[PDB]
């Protein structure tokens, strides 16, 4: 009855939604929670992005990585929706950004890897005695394969070279070589690769 014909309008409304979403993330799901088709949770709205359907992962990356506080608590539930568990640095990262692509300003990638620190810290435990050096050898591993894969750049970091860049991060000390070596070899045989 009011059922079926209301399911059918939510429907739509909600692809509306993802276009909406697609063009100006807040104003998506502004739509979407206005129209009852979303909960206005930072807990539902980060499940929405996950989740991707039909989500333009630019602009979810928009999204994800703006000041404000709902934003802010979308992220951080968002990145808890992943787990990192006994995942080694690269296959985390390589699962967190498949759902998104990274925004072109500074200080959103910032927030945004800055989160991802912290939930890998926290499902690993052992590995890293601060975020901050999960942080930078996260970009340590996104700087090789860009500097791997990107014709411009025109000389290859080695392994040699790679665990040089990294000395002095691992609270002072080093990470284990045979960690860097992992990491190393698997970004160069398994590049990340922009989001579809």
Not at 118 to 147: E, H, K, W
Request: proline content about 5%.
């Amino acid at each position: 009855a009011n059922e079926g014909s209301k399911t059918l309008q939510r429907n739509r409304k909600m692809a509306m939604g993802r276009k909406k979403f697609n063009m100006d993330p807040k104003k998506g799901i502004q739509f979407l929670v206005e129209n009852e088709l979303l909960q206005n949770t930072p807990e539902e709205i980060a499940r929405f992005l996950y989740k991707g359907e039909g989500l333009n992962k630019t602009a979810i990356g928009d999204y994800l990585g703006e000041r404000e506080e709902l934003n802010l608590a979308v992220l951080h539930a968002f990145v808890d929706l992943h787990e990192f568990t006994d995942l080694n640095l690269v296959q985390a990262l390589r699962q967190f950004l498949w759902s998104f692509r990274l925004p072109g300003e500074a200080q959103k990638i910032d927030r945004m890897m800055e989160a991802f620190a912290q939930r890998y810290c926290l499902c690993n435990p052992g590995v890293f005695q601060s975020t901050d050096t999960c942080y930078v050898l996260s970009f340590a591993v996104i700087m090789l394969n860009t500097s791997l894969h990107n014709p411009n750049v025109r000389d290859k970091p080695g392994l040699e070279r790679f665990v040089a860049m990294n000395r002095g991060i691992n609270e002072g000390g080093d990470l284990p070589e045979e960690l860097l070596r992992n990491l190393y070899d698997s970004i160069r045989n398994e590049p990340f690769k922009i989001p579809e």
